[PDB]
């Protein structure tokens, strides 16, 4: 039983050599199991050792496989060859500058994520005292939003980040919202600065596509909108301050 072979279009780019990205074609043997990651391995192993890509966990939990498959943000290890029998094209993750082959500049993401102060703030409790008390009901508030693995697929999916690369982005807003709604956190006021910004929640027109692409079913769109409601509250409660 000789495995079925597949033509794969992979968009390469070398800053030293290439003026602009150009497609390249690779024939990979595949079966029902073969993930794009698997295939990407075969390339570097057998045909193009000069190929460079991001991967690690292999079980879609680390978030590094961020790439575009046929104009869709996907994880390389959750993308399966059997599903692309008609044809398949692989460019690097969208809305980020392409540094080399399938590796993109992730700085903006990291910076955004950082800017929203994502850590327990103002809780004066200490370890010798015992853990905080938080009910299952109290966790439910942020829990789903806490499951983001930082793949950045949301960013490639969101058109507003395309049009505006200063927009802090779905992932980064979600993470802020996650700490806001955590009962343990008393730093809400520190985060609202970035959230209330034009480059914050308000750059989102609710295209909602980020949520569709989310590998971990986080639904960032909901965070952003609850963010909008929360920002508006703060805008009012700020305007009503004569003091």
């Amino acid at each position: 039983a000789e495995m079925k072979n597949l033509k794969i279009e992979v968009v390469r780019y070398n800053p030293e050599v290439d003026t602009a990205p150009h497609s390249a074609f690779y024939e990979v043997p595949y079966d029902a199991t073969t993930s794009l990651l698997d295939a990407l391995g075969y390339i570097k192993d057998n045909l193009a050792p000069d190929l460079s890509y991001r991967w690690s966990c292999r079980m879609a939990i680390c978030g590094s496989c961020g790439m575009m498959v046929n104009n869709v943000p996907k994880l390389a290890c959750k993308t399966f060859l059997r599903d692309y029998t008609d044809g398949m094209k692989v460019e690097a993750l969208a809305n980020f500058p392409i540094e080399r082959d399938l590796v993109v500049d992730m700085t903006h993401f990291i910076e955004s994520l950082e800017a929203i102060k994502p850590y327990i703030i103002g809780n004066s409790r200490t370890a010798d005292q015992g853990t905080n008390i938080q009910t299952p009901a109290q966790m439910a508030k942020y829990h789903q939003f806490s499951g983001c693995i930082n793949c950045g697929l949301c960013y490639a999916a969101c058109p507003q980040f395309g049009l505006n690369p200063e927009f802090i982005g779905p992932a980064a807003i979600t993470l802020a919202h996650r700490y806001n709604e955590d009962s343990r956190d008393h730093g809400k006021k520190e985060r609202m600065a970035q959230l209330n910004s034009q480059n914050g929640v308000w750059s989102c027109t609710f295209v909602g596509y980020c949520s569709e692409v989310c590998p971990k079913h986080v639904d960032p769109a909901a965070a952003i909108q609850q963010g909008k409601v929360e920002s508006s509250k703060d805008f009012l409660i700020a305007t009503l301050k004569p003091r």
């Binding site: 780019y13 869709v72 009910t135 295209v207 569709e212």
Partner: protein
Amino acid sequence: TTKRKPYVRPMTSTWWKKLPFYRFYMLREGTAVPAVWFSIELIFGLFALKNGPEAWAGFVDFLQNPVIVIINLITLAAALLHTKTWFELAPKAANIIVKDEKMGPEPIIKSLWAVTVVATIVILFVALYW
């Protein structure tokens, strides 16, 4: 003197035509144009309504134009799409926890849709029965 040239892809004014999701989003946003058009139409109505029988009868004649009817038929479908979509999105603003679980959105989506139906009737009843 970094050896890197970070290649930035341009974004066309037509980024949306490619993916069907983007298309729908655009079309959904596009519901505003007729939604505003209707409000214009109502201003005409309101205004010609204050100017006695002559103006109003001529305004009802304007709506009687074959094209304007077609336009309004499109305007209805437009606002219907807006409603359908709007209701799918409104719940996502709510963060209610019931029995240790984040709720939504079907309970809201249904609730809202019901209110639309009760309104539709009450209004059609008020407008037509007397």
